[PDB]
From Swiss-Prot, chain B:
Belongs to the V-ATPase V0D/AC39 subunit family. Transmembrane segments: none annotated. This is V-type ATP synthase subunit C. GO terms for cellular component: proton-transporting V-type ATPase, V0 domain. The gene is atpC. Produces ATP from ADP in the presence of a proton gradient across the membrane. One of its GO terms (molecular function) is proton-transporting ATP synthase activity, rotational mechanism.
Length: 619, 320, 80, 80, 80, 80, 80, 80, 80, 80
């Protein structure tokens, strides 16, 4: 049989063992870390690992040069010998092509800059730059500097110096021509003004001007043609063999990871460890073992199966999000109506963007792999837009009517004149309807919170978690005495007094050394109420901006207003989007009050495992 | 002005700072394995050659783009506050530059990085042929280190003296400006920098027969003229009375190397607990000490590995 | 007051003065938070794209404050 | 009920100024308080993704003041 | 005020202005105390995860001020 | 009053005076916040010459508040 | 003003309106005074664990500022 | 904007006060917004002579608040 | 219209008060703005000792906002 | 005034508005002062334990101002 080595954590010893036991692997026996010692890699093993890293790196190097890097999930099993022989010709060829290319590009950059001055300068003293009798010194002057330089030279060098200049479109390249042995004096004069000698890089700088000028003119013409070719040969090599490198990269990487695995396990850096045996047949088999609701749930099953604390499933989160999330969309005239269209561009395809190619083949701004992952997300968006179109007629219950309100289904001048969601009675009930769901979520998090300390068997969490839920009851009690006054809520004016005893009476049994801090527990209650209220009311506000964007905001309303309002409407669209996206972050802002405060959830101030925001990114 | 964007830019950068556990790994490695490790880091990202000149250069160039680009990114009241920190790295360039003009030696073999004075200011200064002109070219970025230079240059043209009176006058200039830009975090640190300077001026010039009052400049915390005079006679019993300061750790120590090691570790510590004050200059303060100290340990660990020096000779100097 | 299609009245007018303070102040606080964070978000994406999502989430959060100040204001004036 | 009008009144206008202080001032303190936390939050996620939970809890925390202020304004203005 | 929900006197409107200030301003002060100390707490977690609590105890103290504003408003509008 | 109102007089005028406070304060918070970041932002544009745009978009974000608040005053001051 | 019950004379109203200025301005002052020491105060612990006590005892002193402002307000309000 | 009889009137005053506010307030926000960014940005051209074009496009983004306020102000209080 | 309260009574009174706010605020936002550019500008004259002309013109740019607010108010009350 | 019945005064109500200013501003100011010395005190322990006394003597001084303010308010209003 094949020997196989296993690791896991101490906490899941039994759950890991049961799963492995089932999977294919048989003869599972535990091993403590002292047993794992002395099975650290021999020097030969470390040399294979070093070499596997070179191949990994070496591909990253070749593949980056050649063009773009792409990491596939497709390796190609090969030897040490096979992978290194593959890599050596292409890296060599490509290294060589990129070097030419850099030299070609630097030469162009200098030649493009300095051809016109050197031409001018060479011309001025033509055939007198290679004479010993006369000395030439080139230098650049701006219009501003030219008088100063001339004065300085003239006093220094009398009237037996020659200052000539010729233009080039902007300043003047100037040449001063002086006798041999009058060089020091000539220089000294330039140095006092702050002007210094122009010399180019390499052989050209050192060559007579006439040679330097002829050659620069030649390099500017030649380079762009040769650059084109080198870039072409390099493109072909990527095109044909970018895959070869990518497949070496993946394979090489798998071997590096395997040998690293054995060095870690060997130093007794995994707490629960197993040894077992699999026949050759069993070896694959071990590795082997309404859409809105079902679809995200089947991917979440992978997190059902790995618990980490006294926590329960992270799955209650998704159906709390959905009603509240759909009800941020409530327009029906140029808000939800426009947004319908948006859905199709993410769940179909567009080419009206540049960084985004065709979505149907998985090509977006986001990385090509990430884009294939967020298909599910894009669907979950599509389901949100769809349901929002329905809750846009729910809103139009409170608008449209031919007798209850003073605005028809569609007036014949312009659709929508004045909104009729400005009735006082109508706004309050839609806010109070919304509040009721926030309350349901307060009970559900703290009831699980208690069950958490019961099955994690820390009484200090149980006791604190039970007590805080008493305060909700007081909070609601007190509200009723003010929402109904004494006409209603005189059925909770006496229970409230005792509701207050419950908040503190269980919490004190754990003692606790910050009694004030209970104020902040009451803060969390309050938020679920305010956020659901903001979710309705701020949602409704979204619609009331659309008054002046695709509704009467010109004349008294008339036929012309229909096609006149669209001036302001388009300008209004980007403004509208930004504030309504702000509301859609409320579901997650709500979730995190409870989730990261260990209300039947994994998190509690830090600790591995993602925020649900990132989970839902892909699901 | 303002540190609002700038602090934020640095907070992302504090993510790629080198933690203690890297230098821990690096000591166990040979030079070949060190080089593979180094390349993972951001200093590694400027690397250009396996050998020693190239390691010194990759380190320096990392400091040039991530730390020496900070004064440009702010202006005014922000800029003066950040600038004082940057100024110490500029003084190092200046003292070497002033020395290349004066003793006639090339531009080369000096420290160059951007900070407050750009690369071009140092080239135009180099090429200046009158010390007074050299000085106006330096005065262009604006800073207290000009104003400090300008007064010293009026008294003298002797190299050794300009160096000492510039440094003394410069920390005095720094202190007054810094006190006027407020914040408790900066004030505590400033006090330590001056106290450390005071001790250190006394050590470098030890036993030269000179005045001990010349080694004490205002900004102090617990140190005075008498401790300096005793110290100058060679007595280290003064450091054994020095507690209530974080230099409590210098007690019972009498080696110059252990003493000076001690001051650099203390200054590191103050700055590392200035992240409980990240508002304004506090965070930047912590960020500069850490980039500097980090860069220093990779250079010492690289030297230690290349020449096969003894481990304990460097294991102690790469931790505080 | 009212906000059905008009809000005319000397009495209502008094309510209008009262509410605009609350909008004012709530909007003022939003301005300091949203801008500072937005700049902070542009630095995060520029160094590391592994924090591009955090930068975006932070931007949205100060938007709730300005809407709160509008909603109270609407409420006292005839509701939504 | 709690905080509503439909007709306005001279009495209401003075009531409107008073309720307006609470939401307006609280949100100004929420905005600044968040803003500073928000700057520091760039740093929390950046050092480690094992303090990233902590940064989220800090950000939620200055909201309590504004929520509290909505509540005082509704209560005072809807108790008999 | 103690009596205000949909109508009330001119007089009642005036107590509502004055008392309104006291709470609103506490929220304001809480937020300024929170801004500085909160921002400092983000440094502490970043360095060491385990001493999130120290930051929290120092922070718990300005909450007391918001609660103090509430009580001034409560007593002066009308005693319980 | 406005060209989309047809109610003027003393009555519209109190509302216009009073509601005017809100936009002015929304502009103040927006103002102070846009300016600080924008200055630091010059360095951003300076660095990113191909991603210069990012800096431009972050500036636009505080403006969103001022303009949104004008539109709210427009509804309130004329809806016919 | 009145302590128990809401104000019912214009004079009682006017006093309430003035007295508010003292508890508001104080309330704000307790807030600012806490923040500089409070933010540092974490630092106290950090530097020296033993002298965590020294930071707290300073923070406590601004709490005094609000109670002194309340006492004047509590007495003065009841009668004209 | 204009003064006349047909861009003038008593009727026009009620419009004029509201619309006048719109330029003032837009002006307020613009001055502070524009100042820091413009202070730093002119400075850049002084230092680096390749940022001048960038500085000019950048400068107009805070100018946008006054230009916006101005369009509202002008049209509504135009002729008729 | 003009600023009066006896050449149009109560209707007029509102215009006069509201218009004063546009000018007053125009003046505040400009005033502070001038300071920022002035402060930065010092650097520019020290750095480039012949680019005196650049500092003076940058400074001029906030003055534009007071000439804008102060005239608008003036034209409108100039009708009568 | 008293909370009990034994005061009345038309004059006194006006005195309450004016006096609310003096207490409130003195507590604001005393607090801001207090904080600087308290942050400074953090430094004082850090520098030297023995001269905790120095922090103490300076720190007494802003207290005098609020205390003085409380007595002034009682004399002007509440003496009877």
């Amino acid at each position: 049989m094949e020997k196989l080595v296993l690791a896991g954590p101490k906490g899941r010893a039994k759950e890991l063992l049961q799963s492995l036991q089932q999977a294919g692997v048989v003869h599972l026996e535990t091993l403590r870390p002292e047993a794992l010692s002395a099975y650290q890699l021999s020097p030969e093993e470390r040399a294979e690992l070093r070499r596997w890293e070179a191949v990994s790196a070496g591909a990253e190097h070749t593949l980056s040069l050649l063009g773009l890097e792409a990491e596939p999930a497709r390796p190609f099993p090969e030897g040490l010998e096979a992978a290194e022989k593959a890599l050596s010709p292409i890296q060599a060829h490509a290294e060589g092509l990129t070097r030419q290319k850099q030299e070609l590009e630097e030469e162009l950059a200098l030649a493009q800059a300095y051809l016109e001055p050197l031409e001018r300068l060479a011309a001025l003293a033509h055939g007198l730059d290679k004479s010993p009798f006369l000395r030439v010194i080139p230098f650049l002057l701006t219009e501003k500097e030219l008088p100063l330089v001339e004065e300085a030279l003239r006093k220094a060098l009398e009237d037996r110096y020659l200052l000539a200049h010729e233009a080039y479109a902007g300043g003047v390249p100037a040449l001063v021509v002086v006798h041999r042995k009058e060089v020091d004096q000539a220089k000294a004069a330039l140095s006092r003004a702050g002007v210094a000698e122009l010399r180019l890089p390499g052989a050209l700088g050192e060559l007579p001007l006439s040679e330097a000028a002829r050659r620069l003119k030649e390099r500017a013409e030649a380079a762009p043609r040769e650059l084109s070719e080198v870039r072409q040969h390099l493109a072909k090599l990527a095109r044909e063999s970018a895959s070869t490198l990518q497949s070496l990269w993946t394979r090489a990487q798998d071997e590096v990871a395997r040998l690293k695995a054995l060095e870690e396990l060997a130093s007794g850096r995994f707490g629960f460890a197993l040894l077992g045996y699999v026949p050759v047949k069993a070896k694959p088999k071990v590795e082997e073992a309404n859409p809105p609701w079902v679809k995200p749930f089947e991917l979440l099953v992978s997190f059902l199966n790995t618990p980490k604390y006294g926590t329960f499933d992270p799955t209650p989160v998704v159906p709390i999000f959905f009603p509240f999330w759909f009800g941020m969309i409530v327009g029906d005239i140029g808000y939800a109506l426009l947004f319908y269209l948006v859905g199709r561009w993410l769940s179909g395809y567009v080419k009206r963007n540049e960084p985004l190619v065709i979505d149907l083949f998985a090509l977006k701004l986001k990385p090509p792999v990430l884009a294939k992952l967020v298909y599910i997300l894009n669907w979950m968006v599509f389901w949100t837009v769809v349901w929002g179109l329905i809750y846009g007629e729910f809103f139009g219950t409170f608008l449209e009517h031919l007798g209850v309100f003073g605005t028809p289904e569609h007036p014949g001048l312009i659709p929508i004149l004045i909104h009729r969601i400005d009735t006082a009675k109508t706004a309050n009930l839609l806010i109070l309807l919304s509040v009721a769901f926030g309350v349901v979520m307060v009970f559900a998090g703290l009831i699980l919170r208690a069950y958490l300390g019961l099955k994690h068997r820390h009484m200090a969490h149980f006791w604190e978690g039970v007590g805080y839920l008493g305060g909700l009851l007081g909070i609601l009690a007190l509200a009723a005495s003010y929402l109904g006054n004494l006409q209603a809520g005189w059925l909770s004016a006496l229970m409230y007094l005792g509701f207050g005893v419950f908040l503190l009476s269980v919490v004190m049994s754990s003692i606790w050394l910050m009694i004030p801090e209970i104020f902040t527990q009451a803060g969390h209650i309050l938020s679920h109420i305010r956020i659901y209220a903001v979710g309705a009311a701020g949602g409704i506000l979204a619609g009331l901006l659309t008054d002046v964007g695709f509704a009467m905001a010109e004349r008294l309303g008339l036929i012309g207003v229909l096609l006149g309002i669209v001036v302001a409407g388009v300008l209004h669209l980007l403004i509208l989007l930004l504030t309504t996206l702000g509301h859609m972050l409320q579901p997650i802002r709500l979730i995190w009050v409870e989730f990261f405060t260990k209300f039947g959830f994994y998190e509690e101030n830090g600790r591995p495992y993602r925020p649900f925001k990132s989970v839902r990114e892909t699901q | 002005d303002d540190f609002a964007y700038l602090n934020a830019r640095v907070r992302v950068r504090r993510g790629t700072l080198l933690k203690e556990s890297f230098f821990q790994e690096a000591l166990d490695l040979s030079f070949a394995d060190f080089l593979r490790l180094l390349s993972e880091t951001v200093y590694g990202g400027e690397l250009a050659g396996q050998g020693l000149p190239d390691v010194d250069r990759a380190v320096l160039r990392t400091q040039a783009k991530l730390v020496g680009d900070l004064p440009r990114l702010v202006t005014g009241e922000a800029r003066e506050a950040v600038r004082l920190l940057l100024l110490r790295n500029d003084l190092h360039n200046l003292q070497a530059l002033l020395r290349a003009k004066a003793t006639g030696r090339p531009f080369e073999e000096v420290l160059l990085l951007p900070g407050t004075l750009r690369e071009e200011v140092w080239r135009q200064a180099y090429e200046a042929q009158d010390p007074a002109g050299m000085a106006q070219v330096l005065a262009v970025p604006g800073h207290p280190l000009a104003r400090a230079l300008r007064a010293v240059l009026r008294e003298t043209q002797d190299l050794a003296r300009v160096e000492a009176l510039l440094a003394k006058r410069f920390f005095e200039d720094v202190a007054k400006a810094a006190k006027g830009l407020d914040q408790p975090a900066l004030r505590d640190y400033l006090a330590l920098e001056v106290d450390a300077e005071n001790l250190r001026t006394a050590f470098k010039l030890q036993g030269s027969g000179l005045a001990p009052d010349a080694f004490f400049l205002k900004g102090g915390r617990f140190v005075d003229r008498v401790r300096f005079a005793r110290l100058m006679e060679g007595d280290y019993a003064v450091l054994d009375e020095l507690s209530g300061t974080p230099f409590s750790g210098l007690s019972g120590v009498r080696d110059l190397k252990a003493l000076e090691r001690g001051l650099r570790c203390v200054l590191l510590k103050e700055a590392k607990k200035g992240v409980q004050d990240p508002l304004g200059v506090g965070l930047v303060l912590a960020y500069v000490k850490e980039r500097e100290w980090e860069a220093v340990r990779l250079r010492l660990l690289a030297r230690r590995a290349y020449f096969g020096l003894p481990r304990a000779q460097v294991e102690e100097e790469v931790v505080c | 007051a009212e906000e059905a299609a008009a809000s005319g009245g000397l009495d209502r007018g008094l309510i209008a003065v009262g509410m605009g303070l609350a909008v004012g102040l709530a909007a003022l606080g939003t301005g300091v938070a949203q801008a500072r964070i937005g700049a902070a978000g542009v630095g995060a994406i520029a160094e590391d794209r592994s924090n591009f999502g955090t930068a975006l989430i932070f931007l949205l959060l100060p938007e709730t404050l300005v809407i709160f100040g509008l909603l109270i204001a609407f409420i006292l004036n005839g509701r939504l």
